[PDB]
Each structure stands twice: as C-alpha cells, then as structure tokens.
C-alpha cells in the first residue's frame, strides 16, 4: 500500500533515467531469516524426534495464542498452525518441500549473482555510466547500489545507501558477503561506498528513497542529506513518484497514495 514494490521501484528509476547512459537492475533480494540444520527437522524428522517437534508445535499454538500485541500474535501463531500442518505431511512430501525451499534458495542467491555481474557487465563493456539495482534486504526493507566502472584505473565502485540509517553491513554483511562472492576475484576489488545517511525511519519510506537516491547516485548528484530528509520530503517525493507514474501507469499511483 504504502509500501513500495519492486514493481514501482523499477518503474520509476527507469522513468527518471536515461536507458543509453543508465542500466535498471533486477532487484536483488535477501531472505531476512537463516536457514538452520534445526529448521529444516520440522522436514527431515521421523518417528520420536519427529513427535517432540510436533508435540512443541502444538505447545506454541496455545501460547502464541496469548502473545498480546495482534498483530505479532497472529503472525506468530499462523506460522505455527503452518508448521503443524507441516507436520501432518507423509514424510515424502515433507522431503519435497525441504527440496523446494533449498532450489529456491540456491536459486536466489545465483539470479543475486549474475544481476551484479550483468550490471557489472553493463558498465565495463556495454557503454553505460551507471548501473542500478535496488536490493531488498528483507520484506520492504528497500536500500539501493550503484554500480560505477572507472576505465582509467579499471576499477569497479559500488554506491549503497539505506534510508533507514542501517549500514551496508544490515543483518550479518549478507550484502558484502554477495559483492566479495561475486565480484572479489577481480584484478582490482570493487571500491565500497556506503552513504549511510538515515533519512526516515519509516519502512513505508524505504522504497520512496531507494528511488530518489538510485537515480541522484546514478547521475553523481548528493542524495538528501539527513537534514533535508527530515518532514514531509518523504511525503512530497511520493506525490511526484505518483505524477511521474500517473503519467504512464495509474494503478501503481493510486497504490502509492494508499494509507496502510
């Protein structure tokens, strides 16, 4: 509603950007919880182990029921049922499910991959100034990284900036740890940039920013600073994203302007 999706994101950066100077990345995304040898039991488990779990599920559910704030509670005790129901499953399909959920993690973090290494492709040998790719570090927790290629030095630098005012290093280097997967081997290592400039705290405004900062970074202009952030800039930003959406696709305006 408020929140912006990557669909809006990508919209709006290519709307404000020119595609022969600039190149819009794919989202990169990461899951916000890790995956543990523990987790994965609630699939692997059988006979008495598996019982002890579903016995703990079931323990849950009548606290989780309890939990006082609503909106927490529910969050915490559907993911209980989801798990007894998980439970419930013939051992086969809980096999399938535990596959599923590892393909689409390795999935994930190569799609994370090759989108730095085509943005890094894009500026070291397509001809463009800038590339930009917005990075989702967990549910709407929108943050942006600029991708810049200096030929004279051959030298690859990375702009990242989080209107939230969390570092690049956010939940564990999750995001370091991709650049150095991907791009570490280079004769040169990518030069980091971190802005960190806390510009709202509000998550509904991640995405507003991730926007207004890919495109000044992308075009070598300051991002606003934390002063200039401070208001209703966040609020006027997402009224011009709207104009700038309405001229061309109205639906993702009138999402925009939605309360939440």
């Given at each position: 509603?408020?929140?912006?999706?990557?669909?809006?994101?990508?919209?709006?950066?290519?709307?404000?950007?020119?595609?022969?100077?600039?190149?819009?990345?794919?989202?990169?995304?990461?899951?916000?919880?890790?995956?543990?040898?523990?987790?994965?039991?609630?699939?692997?488990?059988?006979?008495?182990?598996?019982?002890?779990?579903?016995?703990?599920?079931?323990?849950?559910?009548?606290?989780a029921n309890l939990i006082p704030d609503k909106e927490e509670r529910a969050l915490?005790?559907?993911?209980?049922?989801?798990?007894?129901?998980?439970?419930?499953?013939?051992?086969?399909?809980?096999?399938?499910?535990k596959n599923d959920l590892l393909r689409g993690g390795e999935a994930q973090q190569?799609?994370?991959?090759?989108?730095?290494?085509?943005?890094?492709?894009?500026?070291?040998?397509?001809?463009?100034e800038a590339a930009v790719i917005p990075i989702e570090m967990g549910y709407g927790?929108?943050?942006?990284?600029?991708?810049?290629?200096?030929?004279?030095?051959?030298?690859?630098?990375?702009?990242?900036?989080?209107?939230?005012?969390?570092?690049?290093?956010?939940?564990?280097?999750?995001?370091?740890?991709?650049?150095?997967?991907?791009?570490?081997?280079?004769?040169?290592?990518?030069?980091?940039?971190?802005?960190?400039?806390?510009?709202?705290?509000?998550?509904?405004?991640?995405?507003?920013?991730?926007?207004?900062?890919?495109?000044?970074?992308?075009?070598?202009?300051?991002?606003?600073?934390?002063?200039?952030?401070?208001?209703?800039?966040?609020?006027?930003?997402?009224?011009?994203?709207?104009?700038?959406?309405?001229?061309?696709?109205?639906?993702?305006?009138?999402?925009?302007?939605?309360?939440?």
């Amino acid at each position: 509603d408020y929140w912006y999706t990557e669909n809006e994101i990508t919209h709006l950066l290519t709307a404000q950007l020119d595609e022969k100077k600039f190149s819009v990345q794919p989202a990169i995304t990461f899951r916000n919880t890790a995956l543990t040898e523990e987790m994965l039991k609630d699939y692997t488990a059988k006979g008495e182990e598996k019982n002890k779990i579903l016995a703990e599920v079931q323990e849950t559910i009548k606290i989780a029921n309890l939990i006082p704030d609503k909106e927490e509670r529910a969050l915490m005790l559907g993911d209980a049922k989801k798990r007894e129901e998980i439970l419930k499953l013939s051992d086969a399909e809980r096999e399938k499910l535990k596959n599923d959920l590892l393909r689409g993690g390795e999935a994930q973090q190569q799609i994370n991959e090759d989108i730095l290494n085509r943005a890094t492709k894009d500026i070291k040998d397509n001809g463009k100034e800038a590339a930009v790719i917005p990075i989702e570090m967990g549910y709407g927790h929108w943050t942006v990284l600029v991708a810049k290629y200096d030929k004279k030095d051959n030298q690859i630098i990375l702009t990242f900036n989080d209107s939230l005012g969390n570092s690049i290093n956010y939940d564990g280097q999750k995001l370091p740890k991709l650049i150095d997967k991907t791009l570490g081997n280079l004769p040169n290592k990518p030069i980091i940039i971190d802005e960190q400039t806390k510009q709202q705290t509000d998550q509904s405004a991640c995405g507003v920013f991730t926007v207004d900062n890919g495109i000044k970074i992308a075009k070598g202009q300051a991002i606003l600073s934390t002063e200039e952030s401070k208001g209703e800039k966040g609020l006027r930003l997402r009224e011009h994203h709207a104009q700038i959406l309405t001229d061309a696709m109205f639906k993702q305006d009138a999402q925009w302007i939605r309360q939440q």
